[PDB]
Design a protein around this nucleic acid. Structure first.
Ligand SMILES: [Cl-]
Length: 373
DNA sequence: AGGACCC
DNA sequence: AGGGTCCT
């Protein structure tokens, strides 16, 4: 049973939000700064050589006119992110969030509903919206092609609604599973879409230049694969299954070897409301382990406002720390009476105990509310 | 708790 | 960087 999946990928998301907030930035090169880092930038800045996650000095020495806005407070980005997800959920309810700026939508049922409504002569006029990957020829008699073209039409409706209703541009990719939809959505950027017909799957997967470019193959797995002489997609396709299992475990080995062929049976999961709320701060050294209570009190204060708005409350609190020159965490249940929401002073007490439990009286402090109900 | 992955 | 997910 084949599926029609769309991957929606917002262009330079934080920059888009900031440009909407201050139109004066719309025509100037823009970078969103967090600490010493340019986490993202609009395309005007990318023209001038600015890259994501490029340190501010390197970025200013490449674009001295680069306008910098602070993006350490994620509140506005998070709000717009959920407006996108909710808009897509109106199309079809099964929407999976991947970070703040990507969504997967399973269009299968929607596509079949639209096809049922078409007349015979109507079927021969089905047209693609946007790009066809690798300029592949469409066969209107192929039912897989028809379904994917209808997927491309729904994807264009989504992108038009996002722009008309929210002012945001993004790319979309339409394919038969999540892996392929996500790989194909970035083929034409920015603000464009691409559909992958099945015959071009091997062309898409072999277009990658490192196995680390496969979604799901992270730093540790890549480093491990490279240690085995596996570098290209075809290397992973042809590597011995038995050895790969022994080195990576059978779960990781079998899944990522399927990914190397473009195979991905994973379902689109309805993300729904978030599973956790957290806030953090990075810094160079906080060994005044009495200022930590101040940092933790500030983080806790802002978090408390967010928990009130969601309406659901956390049943677990967690404190994370990073050690000077990799993280450690302590969690514990939140006492039931404390959940009625002055909750600061008890929360600080709980958190400090977790703190003291971990540190003997730091480059990061993070507080998380989780286990929601 | 810790580790893998994602943006 | 400042967030998130699920698995062991
Ligand atoms: Cl499987």
């Amino acid at each position: 049973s084949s599926r029609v999946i769309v991957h929606v990928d917002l262009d330079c998301f934080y920059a888009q939000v900031e440009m909407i907030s201050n139109p004066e930035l719309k025509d100037k090169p823009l970078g969103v700064q967090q600490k010493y880092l340019v986490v993202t930038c609009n395309y005007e800045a990318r023209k001038l050589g600015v890259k994501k996650l490029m340190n501010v000095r390197d970025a200013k020495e490449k674009c001295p006119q680069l306008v910098l806005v602070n993006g350490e407070d994620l509140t506005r980005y998070r709000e717009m992110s959920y407006k996108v997800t909710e808009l897509l959920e109106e199309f079809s309810p099964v929407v999976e969030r991947l970070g703040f700026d990507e969504n997967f939508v399973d269009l299968t049922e929607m596509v079949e509903k639209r096809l049922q409504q078409l007349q015979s002569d109507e079927l021969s006029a089905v047209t693609v919206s946007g790009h066809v990957y690798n300029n592949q020829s469409i066969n209107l008699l192929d039912v897989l092609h028809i379904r994917l073209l209808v997927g491309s039409q729904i994807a264009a409706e989504m992108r038009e609604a996002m722009y008309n209703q929210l002012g945001l541009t993004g790319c979309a990719g339409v394919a038969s599973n999540k892996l392929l939809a996500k790989l194909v959505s970035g083929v034409f950027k920015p603000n464009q879409q691409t559909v992958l017909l099945p015959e071009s799957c091997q062309h898409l997967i072999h277009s990658l230049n490192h196995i680390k470019e496969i979604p799901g193959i992270g730093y540790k797995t890549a480093k491990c694969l490279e240690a085995l002489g596996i570098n290209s997609v075809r290397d992973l396709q042809t590597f011995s299954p038995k050895i790969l299992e022994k080195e990576l475990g059978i779960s990781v080995a079998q899944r990522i070897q399927k990914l190397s062929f473009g195979e991905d049976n994973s379902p689109v999961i309805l993300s729904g409301p978030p599973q956790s709320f957290s806030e953090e701060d990075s810094f160079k050294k906080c060994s005044s382990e009495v200022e930590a209570k101040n940092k933790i009190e500030e983080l806790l204060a802002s978090l408390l406002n967010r928990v009130c708005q969601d309406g659901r409350k956390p049943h677990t609190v967690r404190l994370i720390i990073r050690r000077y020159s990799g993280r450690e965490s302590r969690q514990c249940p939140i006492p039931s009476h404390v959940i009625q929401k002055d909750v600061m002073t008890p929360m600080v007490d709980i958190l400090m105990k977790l703190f003291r439990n971990m540190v003997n009286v730091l480059t990061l402090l993070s507080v998380c509310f989780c286990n929601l109900k």
